């Protein structure tokens, strides 16, 4: 129970140190707070009034993102262009050789 401001046996972290992000971890039956430096893969930060908070990475065939709509690692078969995955790379940019990215 670490990175923690308020902390309990049953809920893990209840409040994070301020530059840490709050994440709800499922471990089977239990869901407990963690206070993390960086959000884990599949998530991204938000520094916020209620809290600094780990939100779910909501984006197209893509494991990890930095932001609301900027993807990092797409899932293969995608071509990462300007932070949003795609089917082909658009007219202007090209699928790279030995890359999963446009130009």
């Amino acid at each position: 129970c670490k990175g923690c401001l308020s902390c309990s046996k049953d809920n893990g972290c209840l409040r994070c140190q301020p530059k840490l992000f709050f994440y709800l971890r499922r471990e089977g039956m239990r869901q407990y707070g963690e206070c993390l430096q960086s959000c884990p893969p599949g998530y991204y930060g938000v520094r916020g009034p209620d809290m600094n908070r780990c939100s779910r990475c909501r984006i197209e065939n893509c494991d990890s993102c930095f932001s609301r709509d900027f993807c990092i690692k797409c899932k293969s078969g995608f071509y990462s262009h300007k932070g949003q995955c795609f089917e082909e790379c658009p007219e202007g940019f090209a699928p790279l050789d030995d890359t999963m990215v446009c130009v």
């Binding site: 049953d10 039956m29 239990r30």
Partner: protein, 153 residues
């Protein structure tokens, strides 16, 4: 407000396909926030800050689970996303067949829940405290999975 007879079942399959159990009984109370109904389902603990309107697409749990929510001392969160009734409502909207709050740290929660008795939820909302609460929590933290059976006699 009626008594909630809750059993928490630990189970393990044997090699022949049959099951063996272990079963801890507790007592609680049904709130007027919710219906007076028995309910049974797998237990799923819900962190208190993890039940909010705010999230647009929350994680998904099979229909017919039993929430368990340990409440913390009320001052540790003064500007909560939702009241304790709001939280109950979420759970049930998200498919909880019943919700059990552990109110040991927050006995005011009780009166709040009962002040929801006009407009009561369709599913049971039980609360537990003291030694009955300590048990439920021990199982949640220590064991892998568990089944609740809540009876209204």
């Amino acid at each position: 407000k009626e008594t909630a007879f809750v059993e928490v079942v630990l189970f393990e399959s044997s090699p022949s396909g049959d099951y063996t159990t272990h079963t801890t009984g507790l007592t609680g109370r049904f709130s007027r926030a919710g219906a007076m109904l028995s309910a049974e389902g797998e237990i799923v603990q819900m962190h208190p800050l993890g039940l909010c309107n705010n999230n647009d697409e929350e994680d998904l749990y099979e229909y017919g689970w039993v929430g368990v929510v340990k409440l913390e001392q009320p001052e540790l969160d003064p500007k909560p996303c939702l009241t304790v009734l709001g939280k109950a409502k979420r759970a049930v909207q998200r498919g909880a067949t019943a919700v059990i709050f552990d109110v040991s740290e927050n006995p005011e929660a009780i009166d709040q829940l009962n002040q929801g008795s006009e407009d009561p939820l369709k599913r049971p909302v039980v609360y537990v405290k003291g030694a009955d609460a300590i048990k439920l929590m021990n199982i949640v933290n220590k064991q892998k999975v568990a089944r609740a059976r809540i009876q209204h006699l």
